[PDB]
Write a protein that binds this ligand. Structure first.
Ligand SMILES: O=C(O)CCC(=O)C(=O)O
Ligand SMILES: O=C(O)CCC(=O)C(=O)O
Ligand SMILES: O=C(O)CCC(=O)C(=O)O
Ligand SMILES: O=C(O)CCC(=O)C(=O)O
Ligand SMILES: [Cs+]
Ligand SMILES: [Cs+]
Ligand SMILES: [Cs+]
Ligand code: NI
Ligand code: NI
Ligand code: NI
Ligand code: NI
Lengths: 256, 254, 242, 253
């Protein structure tokens, strides 16, 4: 089914939505086992690792990327001809962290000028519909019920912020992450296996430092309009203007 | 770089004519190069299209990267820049270009949408952010409507209401470029002029009735995460389909 | 009530000419009542039951409702008479600047407008009811800067000696009206009139409407020291340096 | 004045708690003055409004014009400023304040989903909020049972209406009592100022404890806004001034 009125209200106002129990106990086990099989095929990765391009690596994840349980809520917040921009898995262990990234008005130095909009996450609303160009559906494969489990955390209302947060911090001499220091509007989200966290990538977000033992697991699928390119990092515009990909604005990794 | 006045004009009108950007010798050399390149039939009568001019010619590969085009474009896109298309158009007697673009035109998916995020533009802290702009380099004089003059609906780049759906539903058969419309206006240009265009603007050209060849080369720019321009009919079943699905355009019903 | 096309036009241009709203009979009544008040005619409603009825006429109210879409009140009602060599320099504009004495601002919330779910929300609109034909520039035609009602950069601060109304501007356009036409106007629009050089009286009545929480129009020079000041501090206008 | 982080926070959450604005002495005199107004009638303190504090008391007339209120207010309104509202509030046991405000709540005139008295924007480094309120707390509120200020997250920039669907479906209980996933509580110390974008959908929890809870509220807006006055609808002759609220919980709870 489609997103209810209350769910749209929440995604609009908070920049994300947890849809509980989307995938059952059995499907979740099947997703975990498929990641274990990928470890067997190509051994020798670090224990904290990324699983790039899952739909190509596994027909199980190719189906999950097109599963209507993801696509229907995704269509409801994107409302454009839809394209799969990326699909990857994340395995994390003790002492891993993910610093804050995203945020609506963070700065980027554009050679001869500095800009405070990123049109890959700049979203709007029109005649009863959200239009968010880059959203992500995070399918959790393990329970994350405490901050020391490495819980997803986010800065309240940062998906619609008009002021930059991180440039001031970098030029101030800061060298620690807000996910460690704390911030008056930084909040945690707890989830179960099989939950989907539907995310406006405009939202400034990250995770806490994982302190507990055990493998923290998810699969992430990014979607946007058919005219966006598949996700690829790009350090800068290239001189012949044929460079393609995504140039991040200020993120905590730049100075933490 | 664009002046304050020029920025104001582009923001308020959706476009800017920059007069005499290229000299008469540079124009002639662009014209000469167009005389020997291959064209395709684009589907409009009495129109030839030069597809992918930067690929087919070193002359236009450089023009596409010429700072006389890039500096104004950068000032209205203000994102890491990518070249999305470069093409030429040649037109004779009795050719026409019906209205396309427009900020709030509808697209049916099941659901009906009235935003096209490929042309949805904004403003923030002293800068314009338009994701799809075109630099139109005119290689011929267009001084009267009967020359097939560029025309546009005023303020259509920031319109909040759809214009063309109602027209198709009420049985309209003819294009506003022929009919007329109280806010449809003409732009006249000289050879060597650049027209910098916000693609959210609803625009086209009058029907050309004069002899001679109407000539221009168009270069489209957008952010680095935009795909190179290619029409797409609809999203594909495996969601791997790449391209631009247009909204209502007069060609759908005129 | 406005048609869909009419709303598109009001949205995209910042104004709308509705032709022949009032018949020649009613226009003559309005002209006579203005002769009797003998330049600007303040508070026409409180001075005349004719204009008090006009301010509430539904040929004015219904299009006004379609662009304010808030609980309404009448904020001002005045008449204007002009002869030759009279001129109205440019005022209005979405992003014109104002100094508050410790900072400079580029928004005027009295005219800052928006759109939501099929409806326009313009906090200040004027219905200008014309009582004389204005068919050429030298008649003192209404003129406006295209798209200025949605402008994001200021225009008049940078150039601040002559008025754009005289020298010209690439997007300054003219509007022609017949007697009995209504010019419905978004006050965010930067506008004025050409210099009148012709003979004969130029006559109109203007009614401004806004939300019930807006105060009646009076020009305030600045915020008072006790924060009890009531009224409208205008932003950069041409007559500040012309 | 407001720091950059403070401006960021006001923008993103619709409010800002500025701690320790007023000292213990000042708070006592404010409290003292509200009790002086209580003395007009015999009997115990009752949940009530104290209208027009600036006119009622020289102390509160000065409070309304104090720079510790105006400087932050100015940083979020950025217009020629006008005092729109000045009142005191006493809350006792069993008192409650249901959700009101909200950026896209509906109003039947046709049905409209914008209230231009709270419709705020941003332009070239500055916030523009037409109606903001400085709440000066005269009591500690450190738990929900004390009747803590509560707000629906991000509701100052909501594009969807929340309350119309609840009313039309027969709901008769306030979110404040039932809870809501994005309804959160704000705790304050005596002397704290809560600076508030009135676009925010907010209220307080039901106060379940004894003791009394006091505050003084000052509302500000541009000079072309009228002083606050409830309006039910537009008057017959379009001459009436006032504020017509959109859907609030009081309408149906
Ligand atoms: O691990 C998470 O919970 C979020 C991960 C994330 O935001 C990302 O992969 O970009
Ligand atoms: O021919 C012109 O003048 C404009 C052409 C155009 O707008 C287009 O190629 O889409
Ligand atoms: O004279 C006109 O046509 C318009 C006058 C005007 O804009 C005004 O009265 O504020
Ligand atoms: O009592 C409170 O904490 C809030 C009161 C309030 O929102 C109001 O008076 O408008
Ligand atoms: Cs189409
Ligand atoms: Cs002034
Ligand atoms: Cs009400
Ligand atoms: Ni992320
Ligand atoms: Ni075109
Ligand atoms: Ni005017
Ligand atoms: Ni309140």
């Amino acid at each position: 089914p489609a997103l209810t009125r209350e769910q749209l209200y929440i995604f609009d106002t908070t920049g994300f939505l947890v849809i509980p129990g989307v995938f059952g106990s059995g499907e979740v086990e099947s997703f975990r086992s498929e990641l274990e099989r990928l470890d067997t095929v190509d051994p020798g990765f670090p224990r904290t690792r990324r699983y790039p391009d899952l739909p190509a690596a596994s027909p199980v994840f190719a189906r999950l990327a097109l599963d209507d349980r993801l696509l229907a809520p995704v269509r409801d917040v994107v409302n454009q001809p839809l394209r799969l921009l990326e699909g990857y898995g994340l395995r994390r262990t003790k002492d891993s962290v993910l610093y804050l990234h995203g945020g609506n008005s963070e700065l980027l130095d554009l050679g001869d000028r500095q800009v405070g909009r990123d049109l890959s996450i700049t979203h709007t609303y029109h005649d009863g519909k959200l239009y968010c160009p880059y959203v992500k559906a995070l399918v959790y494969l393990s329970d994350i019920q405490s901050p020391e489990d490495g819980s997803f955390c986010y800065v309240q209302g940062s998906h619609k912020a008009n002021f930059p947060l991180l440039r001031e911090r970098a030029e101030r001499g800061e060298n620690t992450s807000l996910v460690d220091s704390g911030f008056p509007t930084l909040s945690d989200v707890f989830v179960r296996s099989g939950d989907v966290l539907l995310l406006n990538e405009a939202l400034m977000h990250g995770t806490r430092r994982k302190l507990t033992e055990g493998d923290r697991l998810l699969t992430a699928f990014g979607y946007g309009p058919t005219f966006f390119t598949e996700w690829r990092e790009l350090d800068a515009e290239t001189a012949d203007l044929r460079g393609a990909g995504y140039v991040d604005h200020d993120v905590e990794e730049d100075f933490v």
